Amino acid sequence: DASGVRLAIVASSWHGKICDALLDGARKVAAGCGLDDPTVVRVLGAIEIPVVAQELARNHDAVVALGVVIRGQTPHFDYVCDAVTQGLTRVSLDSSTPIANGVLTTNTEEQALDRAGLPTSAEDKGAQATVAALATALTLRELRAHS
Amino acid sequence: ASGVRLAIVASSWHGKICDALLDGARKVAAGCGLDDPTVVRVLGAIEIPVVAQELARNHDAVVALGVVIRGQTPHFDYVCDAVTQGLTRVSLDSSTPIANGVLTTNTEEQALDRAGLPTSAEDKGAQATVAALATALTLRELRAHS
Amino acid sequence: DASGVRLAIVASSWHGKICDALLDGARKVAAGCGLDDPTVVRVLGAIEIPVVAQELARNHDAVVALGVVIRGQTPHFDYVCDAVTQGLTRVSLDSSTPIANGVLTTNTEEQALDRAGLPTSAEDKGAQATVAALATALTLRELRAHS
Amino acid sequence: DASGVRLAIVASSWHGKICDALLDGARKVAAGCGLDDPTVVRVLGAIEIPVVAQELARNHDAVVALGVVIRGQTPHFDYVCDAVTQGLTRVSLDSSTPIANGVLTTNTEEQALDRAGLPTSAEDKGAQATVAALATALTLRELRAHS
Amino acid sequence: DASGVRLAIVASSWHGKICDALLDGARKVAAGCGLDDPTVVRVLGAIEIPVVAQELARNHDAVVALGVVIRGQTPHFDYVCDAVTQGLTRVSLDSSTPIANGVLTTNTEEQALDRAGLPTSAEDKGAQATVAALATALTLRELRAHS
Ligand SMILES: O=c1[nH]c(=O)c2c([nH]1)n(C[C@@H](O)[C@H](O)[C@H](O)CO)c(=O)n2CCCCCOP(=O)(O)O
Ligand SMILES: O=c1[nH]c(=O)c2c([nH]1)n(C[C@@H](O)[C@H](O)[C@H](O)CO)c(=O)n2CCCCCOP(=O)(O)O
Ligand SMILES: O=c1[nH]c(=O)c2c([nH]1)n(C[C@@H](O)[C@H](O)[C@H](O)CO)c(=O)n2CCCCCOP(=O)(O)O
Ligand SMILES: O=c1[nH]c(=O)c2c([nH]1)n(C[C@@H](O)[C@H](O)[C@H](O)CO)c(=O)n2CCCCCOP(=O)(O)O
Ligand SMILES: O=c1[nH]c(=O)c2c([nH]1)n(C[C@@H](O)[C@H](O)[C@H](O)CO)c(=O)n2CCCCCOP(=O)(O)O
Ligand SMILES: [K+]
Ligand SMILES: [K+]
Ligand SMILES: [K+]
Ligand SMILES: [K+]
Ligand SMILES: [K+]
Ligand SMILES: [K+]
Ligand SMILES: [K+]
Ligand SMILES: [K+]
Ligand SMILES: [K+]
Ligand SMILES: [K+]
Ligand SMILES: [K+]
Ligand SMILES: [K+]
Ligand SMILES: [K+]
C-alpha cells in the first residue's frame, strides 16, 4: 500500500540531467504507490542534502536523498561521499526515520547515467531508494506503538 | 540463553544469501532455547540500522544480517561505511549488542562461502547469533542483580 | 534574492593566495545576491574551521567554509581532510545550519589554482560553496515555520 | 602504584591462543602494578568489545580492550577494524575513561603472534595496552578534583 | 595579544625523542607569546590523547595535541590515526575548544624528524599547532560575548 506514508525527497542539482532523472524515478515510484504528493526539495550539491533531510525528517515518515557524485581529478570525491554517508546516517538515527540513499557515487559520467533510469540506463537508483524508504517506513510503523 | 530477547534484522538485497544467513541465525537461536526471535526484513543494508535501533528498545540483542558485494563503482565502500557507522552507533546508544552478520565481499562466490550453505566454509549468520547471545548473557551477569 | 540571510564565511589562510581567491568568489556571490556584508573570519588551518564554524552557526543562517588542503609526502593529508569532513558535517547537523564545504582537497597546487576562480581557472569553488550555502538557507527558511 | 585503580580487561576470544597471550601480558602488568584481581570479561569477537567496554567503564577507572583481527580474503577486515576504532573511541569519550586499544590488526597470523608477547615475540601488545590504561587512569586522577 | 590564553598541551610518549622535539616547539611558541606556563601532560600513546584532551579542555582555552605515529608493517597505523582524528575532532566540538593537531602521521622516522622542528627540520609541527591553538582561542574570544 504505502498510501499513508509521508514522503519527502531531497535532490541535489549538481548534475542536472541525472538528478532530474533520479527525481523522476523517485516521483514515479511514489505515484505508483499512491503518493502523488511527496514533498520535493532541490538543493545545489550532495553536501547540502543532510541538513535539509534533517528538517524534512521532522514532518515525514521517510526521506529519499537523491544526487550524483562523479569522481574528478582530485581526492575531493572521497570527501564529498564521506560527508553524505556520515550525514545521512546520523540524520536517520537522530530522527529514527529512514533516510534512503539514492546518491550515486561513480567514477564516470557513463556509470552515473547508467544508474539514473534515463531511457538507456541499466537501473534507476532513485526508484530503488524510494522503494526502500517506503518499505522501511511501513515496517517501522508496524514495529512501533499501535493498540 | 532461553531468557534472552533476540531480534534479527536482515536485508534482502541478495535474497538467497540473506535467506541462508537467516537460517543459520534462526537455528542457533532455537538450539539455545529461543524458538521465536523477532525477525524483520529490510530492503537494503542501508536500512538495517534504523530498524535495529527500533528493535534494540525491546530486545537484549539484535543480529544484523545482509550481504554487500562490490560492483563497478565506489558505491560498495559507502554502503559498508554507512552500515558500520550505524550499527556501531545503535549498539552504544542502546547499550545492546548489535551483532554484525553483514557480509562485505568482492564476489558473490565469497558471500556464498560465508553464508553457511551445504558447501560453505562458514556460516556468518550463526556466528553473529552466537556472538549476540553470548554478549547479552555477559551483560546480564555484569549488570544489576539480585 | 538572499538579502535577508545572515551569512558567515570562515576561511583557512594556510595557502593564502588560493584562500584570497576563494573568499573573493564567495563575496561576489553574496553581493550579487544582495549581501554586501557577510561575517568573515579567518583561521590558520583547515583543522580550525569546524570549531569556528560552530560558533558562527549560533548567529547565522549559513556558514561557508573555505580553505585548501594540498597533499604532501605523508598520509597526513588524509587525516586533515577526514577531520574537516567529520567536523563540518557534525556542525551542520548539530546547529541545523548549512555549512557549505568550499575546502579544496587537491593533490597539487595547480589543481587548487584551477578551482579557486582565478582569471584562467576552470571553476570557482568559493563561489559555488556560497551559492550552495545561500540557496540552502533560503530553502530551510521556507521549509520552517512562517505565517 | 596502581593498587587503587579499578581496572577491567575485555578480551575477544577469536584467535584464542593470541587472546590468551595478550591477556597474560595484561594480567602480569596489572599484578606488577599492585592489581592481583582486575575485572576480566571475555567476548566472542572484536565487534562485541565496545558495548562490553561501555558497561565496564561505569564501574572502572580504566578498561583494556584485547583481541586480534587478522585480514582474510574480503574487505571485511576493514569494517571490523573501523567498528572497533569508532566504538572504543566513542566509549572512552562518553565515559571519560581510558579505553586502551590492545586489539591487534594484522595482515597475517605470524604478525599477530610476534606482537602478543609470547616467549619469542617482538612485543607484547597486551602488556603495552595495560600500561597505557593504568598510566592514563592515574594521570586523570591527578588532573581531576582532589585535596 | 595571546598572553591571557590558558593553554594545555598533551603529548604522547611513543617515539620519545620526536615527542620531546614537538613539545619543545610548542613550549617555545607559548613562551614566545607570553603565556602562563602551559599545563603539560604526558600520555603513553596517541590513542590516550583524546580522553586527556577532554579533561584538559574543561579548564583551558585551547589544547595542543602532540604525538607521532609512524607506519609499521601492519594496517595498525591507519586505525591509530583514525582514532586520534575522530577523538580530537569530537573533543573540540564537544568542548567548543580548539584542539590543535600536532600529531605527526608519517611513513618513516625520517619524515617525522623532518617535521618536528629540530635544527635541521624542514618544519616545526609542534610550533605550528601551538600558533593555531592560540590564534583560534583569540578568535573565539572575540566572536563570543564581551564588551
Ligand atoms: O552533488 C554533487 N555532486 C558532485 O559531483 C559534486 C558536488 N555535489 N559538489 C559540491 C557540493 O556537494 C557542495 O555543494 C559544495 O561542497 C558546497 O557545500 C562537488 O564539488 N562535486 C564534485 C565532486 C567530485 C568531483 C570533483 O572533481 P575534481 O576532483 O575537483 O576534479
Ligand atoms: O544489502 C545490500 N547489499 C548490496 O550489495 C547493496 C544494497 N543493499 N544496496 C542499496 C541499499 O542498501 C539501500 O537500500 C539503498 O541505498 C537505499 O537506501 C545497494 O545499492 N547495493 C549494491 C552495493 C554495491 C554494489 C554496487 O554496484 P555498482 O558500484 O553500482 O556497480
Ligand atoms: O588549511 C590547511 N591546508 C593544508 O594543506 C594544511 C593545513 N591547513 N595544515 C595545518 C592545520 O590544518 C592545523 O592548523 C594544524 O594541524 C594544527 O591544528 C596542514 O598541516 N596542512 C598540510 C596538509 C597536508 C600536507 C602535508 O604535507 P606532508 O605530508 O607533511 O608532506
Ligand atoms: O576478534 C575478532 N577477530 C577477527 O579477526 C574477526 C572477528 N573478531 N570477527 C567477528 C566478530 O568481531 C563479531 O563477533 C561478528 O561480526 C558478530 O558481531 C570476524 O569475523 N573476524 C574475521 C575478520 C576479518 C577476516 C575476514 O576473513 P574473510 O575476509 O571473510 O576471508
Ligand atoms: O603515539 C603513538 N604512536 C605510534 O606510532 C603508536 C602508538 N602511539 N601506539 C599505541 C598507542 O597509541 C596506544 O597506547 C595503544 O594502542 C594502547 O591504547 C602504537 O601502537 N603505535 C604504533 C602504530 C603504528 C605502527 C605499528 O607497527 P606494526 O604495524 O605493528 O608493524
Ligand atoms: K519522522
Ligand atoms: K529515471
Ligand atoms: K508494536
Ligand atoms: K535493549
Ligand atoms: K546457513
Ligand atoms: K543558525
Ligand atoms: K575567485
Ligand atoms: K513551513
Ligand atoms: K569510569
Ligand atoms: K604475553
Ligand atoms: K574550554
Ligand atoms: K622542536
Ligand atoms: K561577540
mmCIF file with all atom_site columns, C-alpha atoms and ligand atoms in Angstrom, chain C residues 56-63 95-98 144, ligand 11:
data_model
loop_
_atom_site.group_PDB
_atom_site.id
_atom_site.type_symbol
_atom_site.label_atom_id
_atom_site.label_alt_id
_atom_site.label_comp_id
_atom_site.label_asym_id
_atom_site.label_entity_id
_atom_site.label_seq_id
_atom_site.pdbx_PDB_ins_code
_atom_site.Cartn_x
_atom_site.Cartn_y
_atom_site.Cartn_z
_atom_site.occupancy
_atom_site.B_iso_or_equiv
_atom_site.pdbx_formal_charge
_atom_site.auth_seq_id
_atom_site.auth_comp_id
_atom_site.auth_asym_id
_atom_site.auth_atom_id
_atom_site.pdbx_PDB_model_num
ATOM   1  C CA . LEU C 1 56  ? 29.332 31.190 13.680 1.00 0.00 ? 56  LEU C CA 1
ATOM   2  C CA . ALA C 1 57  ? 26.367 28.921 13.273 1.00 0.00 ? 57  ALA C CA 1
ATOM   3  C CA . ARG C 1 58  ? 24.911 30.310 16.576 1.00 0.00 ? 58  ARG C CA 1
ATOM   4  C CA . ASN C 1 59  ? 24.390 33.712 14.920 1.00 0.00 ? 59  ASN C CA 1
ATOM   5  C CA . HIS C 1 60  ? 23.984 32.980 11.176 1.00 0.00 ? 60  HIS C CA 1
ATOM   6  C CA . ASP C 1 61  ? 21.677 31.232 8.716  1.00 0.00 ? 61  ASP C CA 1
ATOM   7  C CA . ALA C 1 62  ? 24.559 29.796 6.688  1.00 0.00 ? 62  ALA C CA 1
ATOM   8  C CA . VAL C 1 63  ? 28.303 29.345 7.056  1.00 0.00 ? 63  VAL C CA 1
ATOM   9  C CA . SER C 1 95  ? 23.247 23.546 14.535 1.00 0.00 ? 95  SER C CA 1
ATOM   10 C CA . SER C 1 96  ? 20.706 22.705 11.811 1.00 0.00 ? 96  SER C CA 1
ATOM   11 C CA . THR C 1 97  ? 22.545 25.231 9.658  1.00 0.00 ? 97  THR C CA 1
ATOM   12 C CA . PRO C 1 98  ? 24.072 24.760 6.200  1.00 0.00 ? 98  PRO C CA 1
ATOM   13 C CA . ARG C 1 144 ? 10.429 26.049 8.508  1.00 0.00 ? 144 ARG C CA 1
HETATM 14 K K  . K   F 2 .   ? 21.850 29.037 12.881 1.00 0.00 ? 11  K   F K  1
#
